[PDB]
Structure 1
Amino acid sequence: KAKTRSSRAGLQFPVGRVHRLLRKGNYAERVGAGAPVYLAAVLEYLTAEILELAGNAARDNKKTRIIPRHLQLAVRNDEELNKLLGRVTIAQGGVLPNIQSVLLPKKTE
């Protein structure tokens, strides 16, 4: 096994596994060679985007280890990730701090 397909694609995500999963997923009769490479790259990119943001969140909370809360903070404070995961629940994620203005002390202000 000279070079893995992931290495040839310059990827960290497993191209061969993605190829195999596409094939066993019954998505189509055939799967072209570039499909698992393109897809692995997208999966890796999205993972990097969320990890970057969750890592920033961990850092803002004085922590070095990303926990579910940080992933939730990262996704919910990001307009696009929030939309992509609009119908997803991150377990142990909690919610963003948010109090409707009218509820704050002194009538409404």
Structure 2
Amino acid sequence: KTKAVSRSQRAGLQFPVGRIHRHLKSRTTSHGRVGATAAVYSAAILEYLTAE
């Protein structure tokens, strides 16, 4: 019980790391969506919404 610190702010990102995990699991994916692979995927989505 020490408050909470969202996975977005821990990563350094403005896109929602939690929401995207829960979207990847229950996509047409196989049965194991590692958590470090929702951070290298909020990033390589937010990067277009900068570069575009």
Is TM (by shorter chain) over 0.5?
yes
1:23 corresponds to: 25
Moved >2 Å (runs of 4+): none
Q: How many Å apart are 1:23 and its aligned residue?
A: 0.3
1:2 corresponds to: 4
Q: How many Å apart are 1:24 and its aligned residue?
A: 1.5
- What letter matches 1:16 in structure 2? G
Provide the C-alpha distance between the structure 1 equivalents of 2:46 and 2:30, rounded to a whole number of angstroms.
23
Q: Which has the larger radius of gyration?
A: 1
Q: How many Å apart are 1:5 and its aligned residue?
A: 0.3
Provide the C-alpha distance between the structure 2 equivalents of 1:40 and 1:8, rounded to a whole number of angstroms.
13
Ranges in structure 2 where 5+ consecutive residues have no aligned partner? none
Matched-pair identity in %: 36
How many residues are matched?
A: 50
State TM-score, norm by structure 1: 0.44
State TM-score, norm by structure 2: 0.88
Ranges in structure 1 where 5+ consecutive residues have no aligned partner? 51-109
Q: CA RMSD in A?
A: 1.0
2:14 corresponds to: 12
- What letter matches 1:39 in structure 2? Y
Provide the C-alpha distance between the structure 1 equivalents of 2:39 and 2:46, rounded to a whole number of angstroms.
11
Provide the C-alpha distance between the structure 2 equivalents of 1:9 and 1:46, rounded to a whole number of angstroms.
17
Provide, for residues 58-109 of structure 1, a one-character-per-residue CA deviation record: whole Å limited to 9, x for no partner. xxxxxxxxxxxxxxxxxxxxxxxxxxxxxxxxxxxxxxxxxxxxxxxxxxxx
Higher relative contact order (CA 8 A, sep 6+): 2
